[PDB]
Structure 1
Amino acid sequence: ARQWQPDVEWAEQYGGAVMYPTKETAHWKPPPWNDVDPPK
């Protein structure tokens, strides 16, 4: 009855490394938050 605003199911579409995940772009995890990688 109120206005629709996006939920977690809608908002997790924009959280991947890409927007349209294909077979090649499937192992791509999103980058780190401070963009700093472990030193390995």
Structure 2
Amino acid sequence: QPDVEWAEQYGGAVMYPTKETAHWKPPPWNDVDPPKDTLVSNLTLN
């Protein structure tokens, strides 16, 4: 039988533990949401 510890080895990350690229995080369950902010939103005039 395979336990939860065995499932964590094949968990969503890199399949193969990373050598150099390990900073890349796992993607979301149903399409990732990116940046909510970092936008202008409504103009101002004098």
Q: Given the two structures, how large is their TM-score scaled by the length of structure 2?
A: 0.55
Q: Given the two structures, how large is their TM-score scaled by the length of structure 1?
A: 0.59
Q: Any unmatched runs of 5+ in structure 2?
A: 37-46
- Which runs of 4 or more aligned residues in structure 1 lie more than 6 Å from their structure 2 counterparts after TM superposition? none
Give me the CA root mean square deviation: 1.7
Aligned length: 36
Give the structure with the higher percent helix: 1
Structure exhibiting the larger radius of gyration computed from Cα positions:
2
Q: Which has the higher contact order (CA 8 A, sep 6+)?
A: 1
